[PDB]
């Protein structure tokens, strides 16, 4: 065990090196290691095949360092890795799309708040067992199609506080067993109509604090099990386009929130749910 780090065998074999002031990934970490805590240090790169010896790794944290890049095969050798935390890494920005290849038994992956500009094609490819996906507080500017396709068992997906401007048809395709989907606090303008299809089991949907002026007829239906919904402070235009959406909020006997209007100038700050239908102009 290397300079000023805890090392214990029960419950699991463990290297705890929290805020030592480390400039990079340390030599010395036993191959027996079942958990590696390298968080709060000041590491600026994860070299190729850093933790390759530790073929037993199930939890590794590298959050709250000064990450500039992860090398594309950093997590090579880590078949069993279950938890991976890579957050509070402010200035990181991009993760090579092959970085996660073959982390087959991964349960949880954290990229909360990393200033991620893109979401490379097939980055979450082959993450069969991924369950929790934390991608909030970044600078994500689009959502490619199929970006999470291979995410069979993802229940919680976290996307808030980004700069997304739209949701395209096939973005959320494959999230067959999603549960909480948080999409609030974005610059979001248009949802694609057939966009939530593959989300039978969706339960929580937070669309508040966006740029949504209207939600078109076909959208919400496939959420056959939605229990909570949030659509507050959007520049909602309350005329014939909302009738579709209006009809929906009537039938929905779960728990929605206020849908305040803003337009026409005549109909400002008026929860839609308590409007009449003839109230909304034509057409």
């Amino acid at each position, epitope marked *: *065990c*290397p300079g000023a780090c805890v090392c214990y065998n029960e419950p699991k074999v463990t290297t705890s090196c929290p805020q030592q002031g*480390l*400039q*990079a*990934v*340390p*030599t*010395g*970490i*036993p*191959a*027996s290691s079942q958990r590696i805590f390298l968080h709060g240090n000041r590491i*600026s*790169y994860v*070299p190729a*095949a*850093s*933790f*390759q*010896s*530790c*073929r037993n790794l199930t939890i590794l944290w590298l959050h709250s360092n000064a990450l*500039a*890049g992860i090398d594309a095969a950093a997590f090579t*050798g880590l078949t069993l890795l279950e938890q991976l935390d890579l957050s509070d890494n402010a200035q990181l*920005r991009v993760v090579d799309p092959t970085t996660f290849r073959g982390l087959g038994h991964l349960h949880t992956l954290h990229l909360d708040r990393c200033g991620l500009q893109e979401l490379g094609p097939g980055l979450f490819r082959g993450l069969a067992a991924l369950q929790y996906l934390y991608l909030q507080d970044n600078n994500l500017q689009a959502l490619p199609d199929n970006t999470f396709r291979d995410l069979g068992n993802l229940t919680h997906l976290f996307l808030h506080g980004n700069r997304i401007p739209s949701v395209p048809e096939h973005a959320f395709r494959g999230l067959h067993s999603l549960d909480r989907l948080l999409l609030h606090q974005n610059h979001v303008a248009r949802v694609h109509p057939h966009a939530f299809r593959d989300l039978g089991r969706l339960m929580t949907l937070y669309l508040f604090a966006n740029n949504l002026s209207m939600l078109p007829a076909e959208v919400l239906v496939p959420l056959r099990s939605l229990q909570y919904l949030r659509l507050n402070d959007n520049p909602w235009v309350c005329d014939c386009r909302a009738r579709p959406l209006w009809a929906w909020l009537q039938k929905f006997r779960g728990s929605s929130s206020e849908v305040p209007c803003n337009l026409p100038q005549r109909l400002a700050g008026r929860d839609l749910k308590r409007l009449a239908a003839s109230d909304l102009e034509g057409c």
Partner: antibody, heavy 119, light 113 residues
Framework: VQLKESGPGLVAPSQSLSISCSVS????????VHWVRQSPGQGLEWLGV???????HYNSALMSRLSISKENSKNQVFLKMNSLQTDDTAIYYC??????????????WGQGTLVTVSA | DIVMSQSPSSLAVSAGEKVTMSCKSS????????????LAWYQQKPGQSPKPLIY???TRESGVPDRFTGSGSGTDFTLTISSVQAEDLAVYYC????????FGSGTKLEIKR
């Protein structure tokens, strides 16, 4: 923390070399070992390494020639080298640290065991 | 492939004069982002194994006298002693750590008297 290279010290050409590198100050499961060579009047040259895990990367400049094994409990790294000419007369240092990264880049050495290829 | 080039192989100075080694690499040794440069310097005193003086082009190993400097980026790397001590007689090797491990050919400090 130290490494102390040893073993067969004159080897006849077209035959086998066997070095051992013994250690105090650290375990072979926790850190990985290297092997640097240096002539009796030339620059250093890196031969290979055996990582904290079972894996092993040599320099292939020496084609088949080369094999690094290590015995973990016995705290010994073995450097075996067959089929060597008098090109390979040199001192044979084992050094350490160790890989992935920070910790050391041959920041520890041996004094180095000097091999002569001659008959 | 990857290659390390040291000049001027051997250079004599009195004790107190400044110096510089020159170490050019075959391929650039700078990590795109974070910008640390994977290059070390080593000191081989006579009849004595090498000893780490510097790594990451720039930063000094534990203990190594504050009187050394190493700089340059990408592909040109200085080692500089200001006010050379008598005890600093050695040959000076730079080492690449980007693609495995490739050494220079070394540069010997002579001492004028």
């Amino acid at each position: 923390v130290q490494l102390k290279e040893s073993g067969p010290g004159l080897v006849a050409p077209s035959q086998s070399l066997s070095i051992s590198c013994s250690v105090s100050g650290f375990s072979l499961s926790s850190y990985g070992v290297h092997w640097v060579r240096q002539s009796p009047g030339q620059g250093l040259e890196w031969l290979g390494v055996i990582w904290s895990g079972g894996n092993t990367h040599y320099n292939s400049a020496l084609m088949s020639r080369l094999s690094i094994s290590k015995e973990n409990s016995k705290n010994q790294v073995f450097l075996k080298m067959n089929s060597l000419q008098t090109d390979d007369t040199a001192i044979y240092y084992c050094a350490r640290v160790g890989i992935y990264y920070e910790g050391a880049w041959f920041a520890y050495w041996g004094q180095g065991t000097l091999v002569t290829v001659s008959a | 492939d990857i290659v390390m080039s040291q000049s001027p192989s051997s250079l004599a100075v009195s004790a107190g004069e400044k110096v510089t080694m020159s170490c050019k690499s075959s391929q650039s040794l700078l990590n795109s982002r974070n910008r640390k440069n994977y290059l070390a310097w080593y000191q081989q005193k006579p009849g004595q194994s090498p000893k780490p003086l510097i790594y990451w082009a720039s930063t000094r190993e534990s203990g190594v006298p504050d009187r050394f400097t190493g700089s340059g980026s990408g592909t040109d790397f200085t080692l500089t002693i200001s006010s050379v001590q008598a005890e600093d007689l050695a040959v000076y090797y730079c080492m690449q750590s980007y693609n495995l491990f490739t050494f220079g050919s070394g540069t010997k400090l002579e001492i004028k008297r």
